[PDB]
Scaffold this active site. Sequence first.
Site, PDB file in Angstrom:
ATOM      1  N   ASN A  33       0.831  -1.199   0.000  1.00  0.00           N
ATOM      2  CA  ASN A  33       0.000   0.000   0.000  1.00  0.00           C
ATOM      3  C   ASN A  33       0.870   1.255   0.000  1.00  0.00           C
ATOM      4  O   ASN A  33       1.430   1.633   1.040  1.00  0.00           O
ATOM      5  CB  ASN A  33      -0.924  -0.021   1.216  1.00  0.00           C
ATOM      6  CG  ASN A  33      -1.874   1.148   1.245  1.00  0.00           C
ATOM      7  OD1 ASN A  33      -1.925   1.966   0.312  1.00  0.00           O
ATOM      8  ND2 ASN A  33      -2.636   1.245   2.326  1.00  0.00           N
ATOM      9  N   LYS A  72       0.008   4.163  -0.256  1.00  0.00           N
ATOM     10  CA  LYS A  72      -0.768   5.282   0.273  1.00  0.00           C
ATOM     11  C   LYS A  72      -0.576   6.485  -0.624  1.00  0.00           C
ATOM     12  O   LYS A  72      -0.415   6.325  -1.845  1.00  0.00           O
ATOM     13  CB  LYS A  72      -0.401   5.557   1.741  1.00  0.00           C
ATOM     14  CG  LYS A  72      -0.613   4.325   2.590  1.00  0.00           C
ATOM     15  CD  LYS A  72      -0.454   4.582   4.094  1.00  0.00           C
ATOM     16  CE  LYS A  72      -0.723   3.294   4.838  1.00  0.00           C
ATOM     17  NZ  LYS A  72      -0.697   3.477   6.349  1.00  0.00           N
TER      18      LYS A  72
HETATM   19 NA    NA Z   1      -1.725  -0.621   4.868  1.00  0.00          NA
END
Ligand code: NA
Lengths: 247, 247
Positions: free
Chosen positions: A9, A11
């Site tokens: 991830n 982000k």
């Molecule tokens: Na995460």
Amino acid sequence: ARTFFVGGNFKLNGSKQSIKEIVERLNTASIPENVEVVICPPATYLDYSVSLVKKPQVTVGAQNAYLKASGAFTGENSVDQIKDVGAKWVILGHSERRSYFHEDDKFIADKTKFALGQGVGVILSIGETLEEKKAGKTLDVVERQLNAVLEEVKDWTNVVVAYEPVWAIGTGLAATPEDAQDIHASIRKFLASKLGDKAASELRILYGGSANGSNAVTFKDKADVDGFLVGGASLKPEFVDIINSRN
Amino acid sequence: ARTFFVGGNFKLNGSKQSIKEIVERLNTASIPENVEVVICPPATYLDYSVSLVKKPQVTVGAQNAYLKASGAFTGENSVDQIKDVGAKWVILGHSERRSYFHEDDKFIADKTKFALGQGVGVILSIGETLEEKKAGKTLDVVERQLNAVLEEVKDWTNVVVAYEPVWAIGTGLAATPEDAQDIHASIRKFLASKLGDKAASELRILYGGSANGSNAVTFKDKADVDGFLVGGASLKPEFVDIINSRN
Ligand code: NA
């Protein structure tokens, strides 16, 4: 056996150049045949990311999508547009969306049913706050979040559960391997009571929250920890070391 | 005089094939020398859209972005990532985000300050609902929404304002060019009192209701209507007729 699964991830981080670096490393560094890797860049880079991948172990996922495929929902991502550019997964229910973006248990459940129905896999995130843990309510909390999805979703073949303690996010304070193991075991047993034993035995339950190249191998023999949802370290060379941590 | 500005909000609609047809059609179309056109596809298609654009008058914009450039904000778009792929604008405060996703007035203001500070233009959406119109609240609502931004940003050189008659959506009411002109004129006059006369006279105020190839010409002589933020017609050949509507 449950295939080891490592999600990345990114982000709100990345650029075309840094992501090109990340994907070229995965393409050219040794990783197992026996692994399922899913990198989740910002929506802006999903198309470019898919275009770079040259290992079948690696696919691309979005970090969120809406519960409709099209319409007057300015600013949202669509599972259909995710599929159009070749991505195969979406993270739903990340604590950052549950906390800052008002996504309640049911919204997450409705999005999960919808994504799966459009043929996209779901990385379903769950996890308790530090206050909840201190209160002894870790299980009550994750059961509640899982129950909402169970209400709407009968088939979890293409779901991967990411258990992430909220206090473990961005703080460098990982759960201990023993603690994550006991928690994952509890989660699996609860899901067995709902989905049946076979489905629970096949479901990957990932650990997330300050997972990194140094500590990933400390989870190597935890039988109910089936992989990781990696945050910051997924932007770094050590993401490869996480991928190989059970080599 | 103020430069004619036409934005195309795709909303949650589009595919790589749509993007190709829409941009290649713009590329070879005859449009005015000095019009400013901004196409705003799903974030998934920002990169690809910029790669296909050849018309100087056309730039690409996102449909929403967060109020930080990077960080632990899973699922968000970043203005730095918008810039990275060559896009130049972002829509903020669309009625669909203010309502469905609980984006409050200050949230919009903070995003606006941040996007402008990062060198991205802002298409700032405002507008009142049917209920608000029926209570005589039209200007209280838009002035509230604009005041929140003014609290954070006073240099609106790189802002265009899009007024959405939310009250006309599905309600059986239509906003007329005469209505558009009256509200735009009031908005401009309010903003002159905050920003000064010169700034207010340069600020583009766009009609952000239902406009298409047929009706865009009916707004042509309205002094205070400086363009459009177009919805569904963005994906259609008549988007070109809108751009050419003041010829
Ligand atoms: Na995460």
